[PDB]
Design a protein around this nucleic acid. Structure first.
Length: 230
RNA sequence: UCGGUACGGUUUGUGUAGGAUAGGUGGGAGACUGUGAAACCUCGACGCCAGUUGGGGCGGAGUCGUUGUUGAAAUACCAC
C-alpha cells in the first residue's frame, strides 16, 4: 500500500492474458524492486472438494530443484551411513541422534529415518513437528531406500494440496533464477496437475491461474497454452 | 430508479492475548517512513464478539515496521 508497492510492477496490465514466456519476464521485473523471496503460483481449479473422490492431492518432480539448501539429517546405522552421504546429506547420524535433536542442534531442514530406527522416531517429532523438520512416511521421507530418500528433499518435489475453496498453492523457486530454469519448473507442474485430474471435475478444469513473487499484483496467466512452457 | 450476471476495488467474521489464533489456505526475515499518547471523520455501518480501529482532511518530521509462535499458520503481512 506504499509508493514502493505500486512501483513494483507498475506496467503489468489486468486485461491482457500473458504467456508463461511473458510471465517469466515480468517475474524478473517484479523482482527488480524488492529483495529475494519465494515465487508463489496460485491456481483456481474447477473442482469441488465437498466430495471425497474429487479431492486433489499429489506431487511433482521439479527439474531445477526448489531454491532451498535442504540439509538432511539421516538416522543412519550400518550400511545406511555409506549410502546417505553418497547422495548429498551433510548430516550422517547414529543411534545417539535422539540427544542431538532434543539437545539444541537443529541445523538442518528435514529428518529421514530407517526402519531399524522407527521405534525411536516417536520421541523426536514433538519438537520438529511444528518446525516442519519431522520424518513423515506419508510424504515419502521414511523408507529403507536412503539412496533416493535423500534425493527426495534434494530434488525439491513440492507437495501441494488444494484448499477448502478449490485453490492451489505452488512454488517454482527463488525470484533471482533464470527465465529458462523457472519455465521448466513451472511447465512440469501443469504437465502433472492435468495427469492427476479427477474423473468427475465438471466444467473447465484450470480456469484461473496467476504467478506473483515479490510484493505486487498477480500476473494474468493464460490457461489456454499448455504446450509451449519453454 | 429497482434487481440478476460477469469482471474489478475496499470492508466485515475469529472460544482466548500482545494487530478478539489481523477469516480459511499456502508462502514467508523483510516490509514501512514511520512523534499519535492525539486533535479533524471519534473505525466509515457495527460499538454485542473487547478494543477490531481515527484507514492520514497530520508531517515525509523524527521514537508504535522489526518484537512474544506460550492458540487447532499467530508475527518476519502478504505473491488468494
Amino acid at each position: 500500500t506504499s509508493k514502493a508497492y505500486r512501483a513494483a510492477a507498475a506496467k503489468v496490465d489486468r486485461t491482457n492474458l500473458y504467456t508463461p514466456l511473458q510471465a517469466a519476464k515480468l517475474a524478473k521485473e517484479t523482482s527488480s524492486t524488492k529483495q529475494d523471496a519465494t515465487v508463489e503460483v496460485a491456481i483456481r481449479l474447477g473442482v469441488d472438494p465437498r466430495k471425497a473422490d474429487q479431492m486433489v492431492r499429489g506431487t511433482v518432480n521439479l527439474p531445477h530443484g526448489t531454491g532451498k539448501t535442504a540439509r538432511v539429517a539421516v538416522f543412519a546405522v550400518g550400511e545406511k551411513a555409506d549410502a546417505a552421504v553418497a547422495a548429498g546429506a551433510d548430516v550422517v547420524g547414529s543411534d545417539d541422534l535422539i540427544e542431538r535433536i532434543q539437545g539444541g542442534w537443529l541445523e538442518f531442514d528435514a529428518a529421514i529415518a530407517t526402519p531399524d530406527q522407527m521405534a525411536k522416531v516417536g520421541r523426536i517429532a514433538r519438537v520438529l513437528g511444528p518446525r516442519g523438520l519431522m520424518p513423515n512416511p506419508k510424504t515419502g521421507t521414511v523408507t529403507a531406500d536412503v539412496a533416493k530418500a535423500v534425493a527426495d528433499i534434494k530434488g525439491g518435489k513440492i507437495n501441494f494440496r488444494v484448499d477448502k475453496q478449490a485453490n492451489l498453492h505452488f512454488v517454482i523457486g527463488k525470484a533471482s533464477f533464470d527465465e529458462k530454469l523457472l519455465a521448466e519448473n513451472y511447465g512440469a507442474a501443469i504437465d502433472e496437475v492435468l495427469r492427476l485430474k479427477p474423473s468427475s471435475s465438471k466444467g473447465r478444469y484450470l480456469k484461473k491461474i496467476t504467478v506473483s513473487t515479490t510484493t505486487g499484483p498477480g500476473i494474468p496467466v493464460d490457461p489456454s497454452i499448455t504446450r509451449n512452457f519453454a
